[PDB]
């Protein structure tokens, strides 16, 4: 699980925060000494997951972003209460983007029926340090 240098960020799950998240992700990737390609890869991959989450998020949902810098890789987990389990449908362009830019990308959700009180949907991905 999360090391001592992990950071959890929480912002309202909305389109107005989409660019804010990107700026924070880029700051973390630079702070983690990722090279220029890796910082851009991380920004794009996390922007993709945050866009998908937000665009299905419940009206008053929080987007949670956990960045866990480990020895050889940086692991990111993004999640939000969403109105569907098909936040990132298999076969979509999003899946192609995510697997091109990150490693071990996986979606998951809490199995609750989304229409009742939403269902927390999460995406994890790994940026290799080298």
């Amino acid at each position: 699980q999360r090391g001592v240098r992990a950071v959890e960020l929480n912002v309202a799950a909305r389109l107005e925060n989409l660019a804010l998240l990107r700026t924070l992700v880029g700051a973390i990737g630079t702070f983690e000494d990722l090279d220029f390609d890796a910082v851009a890869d991380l920004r794009l991959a996390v922007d993709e997951v945050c866009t998908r989450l937000i665009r299905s998020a419940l009206p008053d949902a929080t987007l949670r972003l956990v960045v866990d810098p480990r020895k050889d890789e940086v692991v990111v987990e993004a999640s939000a209460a969403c109105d569907t389990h098909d936040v990132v449908a298999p076969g979509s362009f999003s899946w192609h983007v995510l697997t091109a830019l990150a490693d071990d990308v996986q979606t998951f959700h809490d199995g609750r029926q989304p229409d009742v009180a939403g269902s927390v949907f999460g995406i994890t991905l790994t940026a290799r340090r080298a």
Partner: protein
Amino acid sequence: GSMSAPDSITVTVADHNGVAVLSIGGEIDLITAAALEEAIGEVVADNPTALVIDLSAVEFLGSVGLKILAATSEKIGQSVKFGVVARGSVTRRPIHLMGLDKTFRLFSTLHDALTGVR
């Protein structure tokens, strides 16, 4: 980037000796995607012989921008010389990683693109 004064993209169109060059600055994301697609549609509507989209000043290129570039290539490419200026980690790299540099012509600089669409 305040809520008062949100960031948007910068759009400029110039003719370079017959070639329409659309240049974008800033971040292309789900919010600004409509602005980008409107700008392309306006240039296309003026019926160019050649179109270069210059992403030199683009600070972020989201997946939606990738979609719009490939869709543009599909919707003009037969009737119009099409080229994209992209360099570095933000722009040409994701285009390359997604295999879209096989879909439309990439160039490192505007100078290269201009000779290339001719």
